[PDB]
């Protein structure tokens, strides 16, 4: 149930990190062009935190980014309510 | 119940502020290298606000940042719904 959510999130993350870096190479001055830092990017995104170190300059990138948000925000949001209830139900 | 949430949040905050500053020293040009400003950082984070003044450049830092989000977003989100219901239940 919830493990589904975490993984599903983790999946999306690995996907979007992969894709953005793939979508972003070839564009002179693209920042978002190695998986490690694509991964950080992908995280800061789905948390709706969004710090501005890193972002897609490419079009395809930004479409990666879109999918990442929709998918990620939800799949992350799932893990947040999971740890609230767990905190709630016990106490 | 809710006091649990506030503290638990405050805890995470003090933790992540501590850790990030610890994780971030030694890296030439790390910004996020004093508790005060680590604390501000940690706040702007768990609120999913995320302004871009400050962030971890280090790896370990970013892993601090991760824990901070997951923990913080939830523990903060708990205090938000607490003050909604309170606003709701009265009015």
């Amino acid at each position, epitope marked *: 149930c919830a493990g589904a959510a975490t993984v599903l999130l983790v999946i999306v993350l690995l996907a979007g990190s*992969y894709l953005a*870096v*793939l979508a*972003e*190479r*070839g*564009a*002179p*001055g*693209a*920042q978002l*062009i*190695t*998986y*490690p830092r694509a991964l950080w990017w992908s995280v800061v995104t789905a948390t709706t935190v969004g710090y501005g170190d890193l972002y897609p300059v490419t079009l395809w990138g930004r479409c990666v980014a879109v999918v990442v948000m929709v998918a990620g925000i939800t799949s992350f949001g799932l893990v947040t309510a999971a740890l609230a209830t767990w905190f709630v139900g016990q106490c | 119940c809710a006091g649990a949430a506030t503290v638990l949040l405050v805890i995470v905050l003090l933790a992540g502020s501590y850790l990030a500053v610890l994780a971030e020293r030694g*890296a*030439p*040009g790390a910004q996020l290298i004093t508790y005060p400003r680590a604390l501000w950082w940690s706040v702007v984070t768990a609120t999913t606000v995320g302004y871009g003044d400050l962030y971890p*450049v280090t790896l370990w830092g970013r892993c601090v940042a991760v824990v901070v989000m997951v923990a913080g977003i939830t523990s903060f989100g708990l205090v938000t719904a607490a003050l909604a219901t309170w606003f709701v239940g009265q009015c």
Partner: antibody
Amino acid sequence: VQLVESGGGLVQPGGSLRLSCAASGYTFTSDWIHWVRQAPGKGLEWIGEIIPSYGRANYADSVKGRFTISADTSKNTAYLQMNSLRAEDTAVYYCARERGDGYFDYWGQGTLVTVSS
Amino acid sequence: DIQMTQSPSSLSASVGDRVTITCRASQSIGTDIHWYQQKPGKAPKLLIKYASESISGVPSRFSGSRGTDFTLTISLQPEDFATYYCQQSNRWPFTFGQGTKVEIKR
């Protein structure tokens, strides 16, 4: 996990050659093979990169759309199709593995490509 | 594009001496710089990754540090006559420096 290169010697100015870089090693889903170049008594010049997985491969305005980079995943090899050669292109040509991280852990042996009439 | 300016081209330092090599990036490349030994005729051999981190097998004499000024430092041996190379990964595409010939003195 070594890298084995083949092809490359003499070509007519404006001619074409195809260079090879065989896997010969535990190679992952998502390694970029790159291509780096060394002119006689000169530094190095990043030229090209490729994921075999999706076959997308970016070049350098110095090799413009003059060269192409191919990825036969069955043979576990990536290639360097070489159109429109110039006397400048006279150089030695290394491929390299880069695991999406931004440095070159392994390298091909290097072959020489000579451009003259 | 991003310009790694290595300094200096040539070194005539005596063996056992301490030797350093400088890579001024045109802009902040973060910590995304890599050092490569390329011996006459052989292929490059990545000596340092991410500015300071070392690779399995590379001797303990080899270390890299730091602003936009990146350094590779030799505390020097006969096997070390090489050209040393410097590699950006902050922005697409990747870039090298001109490179530094060390030459041993005796």
